[PDB]
From TrEMBL:
It comes from Mucor circinelloides. The lineage of its organism: Eukaryota, Fungi, Fungi incertae sedis, Mucoromycota, Mucoromycotina. It comes from the Eukaryota. One of its GO terms (molecular function) is peptidyl-prolyl cis-trans isomerase activity. Residues 19-107 form the PPIase FKBP-type domain. Keywords: Isomerase, Rotamase. Pfam families: FKBP_C. Signal peptide: none annotated. Its EC number is 5.2.1.8. InterPro entries: FKBP-type_PPIase (IPR050689), PPIase_dom_sf (IPR046357), PPIase_FKBP_dom (IPR001179). This is peptidylprolyl isomerase. It catalyses: [protein]-peptidylproline (omega=180) = [protein]-peptidylproline (omega=0).
Amino acid sequence: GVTVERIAPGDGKNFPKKGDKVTIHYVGTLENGDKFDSSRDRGSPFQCTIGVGQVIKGWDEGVTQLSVGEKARLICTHDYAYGERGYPGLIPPKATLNFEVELIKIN
Ligand SMILES: C=CC[C@@H]1/C=C(\C)C[C@H](C)C[C@H](OC)[C@H]2O[C@@](O)(C(=O)C(=O)N3CCCC[C@H]3C(=O)O[C@H](/C(C)=C/[C@@H]3CC[C@@H](O)[C@H](OC)C3)[C@H](C)[C@@H](O)C/C1=N\NC(C)=O)[C@H](C)C[C@@H]2OC
């Protein structure tokens, strides 16, 4: 893998740890910027438990590098995303994926 491209900084103090819940807005795109999904388009950020295998590994390893308020691109190689199988109807095999994420809240 995960490469963190910095866009807008967070508070530099509050970073998620394994087992934390996080609230994150994301836009997911292919390498050329073609969007495959977006929580912003749904008017509501995504929530999950981080670092425990509940989301793709690029999130588990990348989101813990962000501080609250930060906007960044999490660029995931396929072994940190959907791997050899891809995601049916959405993601091809072996796809590098971009998630432009904004960390809104930690619990
Ligand atoms: C397959 C589970 C379906 C089931 C579906 C829902 C509750 C509906 C929900 C609104 C859909 C997701 O919207 C948040 C969509 O999210 C994306 O659009 C996205 O942007 C996207 O990549 N993500 C969304 C935001 C965080 C990072 C990432 C992610 O990790 O997504 C989870 C997922 C598909 C995990 C695979 C699981 C299989 C396993 O083999 C793989 O290993 C590599 C991993 C996703 C949160 C999953 O856990 C949720 C689910 N059940 N969970 C349980 C039961 O615990 C992807 C591309 C496609 C997803 O639609 C299917």
